[PDB]
């Protein structure tokens, strides 16, 4: 479907690159979402910045808050890709 294609294209292009995923997460969020301000690379340079923004990303898309919601399935998808992105970032 159109909402799921979006996210799956997003993941594909951004290559588990956390910065790339964070600085573009606002393009895949469900219409309705207000708790997320778009973030530029300017605010994703240092590992402090990546961390601080990542911990803000996962809150928005957390599968617990998303439980029951019409977008639940997409919150999950983004969560999981971000977790993997971040662990790749931790291992680097």
């Amino acid at each position: 479907d159109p909402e799921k294609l979006k996210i799956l294209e997003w993941i594909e292009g951004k290559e588990r690159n956390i910065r790339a995923l964070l600085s573009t997460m606002h393009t895949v969020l469900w219409a309705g979402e207000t708790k997320w301000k778009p973030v530029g690379m300017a605010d994703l340079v240092t590992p402090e910045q990546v961390k601080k923004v990542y911990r803000k990303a996962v809150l928005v898309v957390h599968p617990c808050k998303a439980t029951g919601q019409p977008y639940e399935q997409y919150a999950k998808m983004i969560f999981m890709e971000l977790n993997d992105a971040w662990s790749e970032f931790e291992n680097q």
């Binding site: 957390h62 599968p63 617990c64 439980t67 029951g68 639940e72 399935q73 999950k76 999981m80 977790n83 993997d84 971040w86 662990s87």
Partner: protein, 383 residues
């Protein structure tokens, strides 16, 4: 490292952990994989779990239990006032909030219900830490599906007080269904029935599953039916026998009746896989040894009405879910009383020999699924 799953249960609590590819349900220091939700206060120690439950006869007024029934509630709640009569410990009013008043180290002391449940949670937390060799902070904690926001927020509050960071509060029959990986199947939506008979409460929930998404379609049961009642049907059987044999009524005796209750719970478990059990109490009443026997057939007979009566809430759940029984795709056995062979039969017959999901210790299934969910809410489980 890991996040754990905790079933915070009316009568028993159980902690599990997803680790090295498997869920482990973790035994306490006494060897037990479930732990009484009991807190006892003596002159010298705060007792939690078994040590608390094991001393309830010598110290009934200070052995708190059943805090899950007070959590998220106002003192002027009908439910609080009803239940209070049944407890030997005192419940007081602190500005419209229930507290439990006890004697601890010579002093009177009161605790909020989330504080008592925090003690149980702390205990469970240590059980996991003893097994894992490190500190536990992150946990998913489960609640009944019928729990409201105030009860769910109070359960989360209990975690915080236990020094825990609660990743999510999830529903019990949903956890059990996660334990079975019922969400990891391709195809049309699935109707799942969770038949859950614990120690104090009976819960039937019907759930739909499609694309890994859960909704609760209906719930039913009885907040005052579980293994404790089958124990009672046994106690009075033996109060009566004792009387006939010795011409003494142990019924006035609270310590004597409590001691027989334990004897009784213990034999009932034996009766789930053996066809008779032995009762053996030294000096039960005014110096008299009570030794005796009971068969499974007899146990079943003393409970025949309460066993059979668990089918009403099933029927009721189906008619609220607007489903005929044949439209249920999975049935899940949860709660330690579902181990009783007669219960197994009656549910399966009701479903016309359809096979039951029970390969996972039913009293462990909730904690199991919570453990699975705690790993997922961390990133300890990918792909």
């Amino acid at each position: 490292g890991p996040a754990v799953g905790i079933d915070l249960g009316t009568t028993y609590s159980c902690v599990g952990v997803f680790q090295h590819g498997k869920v482990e349900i973790i035994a306490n220091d006494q060897g037990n994989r479930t732990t009484p939700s009991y807190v006892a206060f003596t002159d010298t120690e705060r007792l939690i779990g078994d040590a608390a439950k094991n001393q309830v006869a010598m110290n009934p007024t200070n052995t708190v239990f059943d805090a899950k029934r007070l959590i998220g509630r106002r003192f002027d709640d009908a439910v609080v006032q009803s239940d209070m009569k049944h407890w030997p410990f005192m419940v007081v009013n602190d500005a419209g909030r229930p507290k439990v008043q006890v004697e601890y180290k010579g002093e009177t002391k009161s605790f909020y219900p989330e504080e008592v449940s925090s003690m149980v949670l702390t205990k469970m937390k240590e059980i996991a830490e003893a097994y894992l060799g490190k500190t536990v902070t992150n946990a998913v904690v489960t609640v009944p599906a019928y729990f409201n926001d105030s009860q769910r927020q109070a359960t989360k509050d209990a975690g915080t007080i236990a020094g825990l960071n609660v990743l999510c509060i999830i529903n019990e029959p949903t956890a059990a269904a996660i334990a079975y990986g019922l969400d990891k199947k391709v195809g049309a939506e699935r109707n799942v029935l969770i038949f859950d008979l614990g120690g104090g409460t009976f819960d039937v929930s019907i759930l739909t599953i499609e694309d890994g998404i859960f909704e609760v379609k209906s719930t039913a049961g009885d907040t005052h039916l579980g293994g404790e009642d089958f124990d009672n049907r046994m106690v009075n059987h033996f109060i009566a026998e004792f009387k006939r044999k010795h011409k003494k009524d142990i019924s006035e005796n609270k310590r004597a009746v409590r001691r027989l209750r334990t004897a009784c719970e213990r034999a009932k478990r034996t009766l789930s896989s053996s066809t008779q059990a032995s009762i053996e109490i030294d000096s039960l009443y005014e110096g008299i040894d009570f030794y005796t026997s009971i068969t499974r057939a007899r146990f079943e007979e003393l409970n025949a009405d309460l066993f059979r009566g668990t089918l009403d809430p099933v029927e009721k759940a189906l008619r609220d879910a607007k489903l005929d029984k044949s439209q249920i795709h999975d049935i899940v056995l949860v709660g330690g009383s579902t181990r009783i062979p007669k219960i197994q039969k009656l549910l399966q017959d009701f479903f016309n020999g359809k096979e039951l999901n029970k390969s996972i210790n039913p009293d462990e299934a909730v904690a199991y699924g919570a453990a699975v969910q705690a790993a997922i809410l961390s990133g300890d489980k990918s792909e």
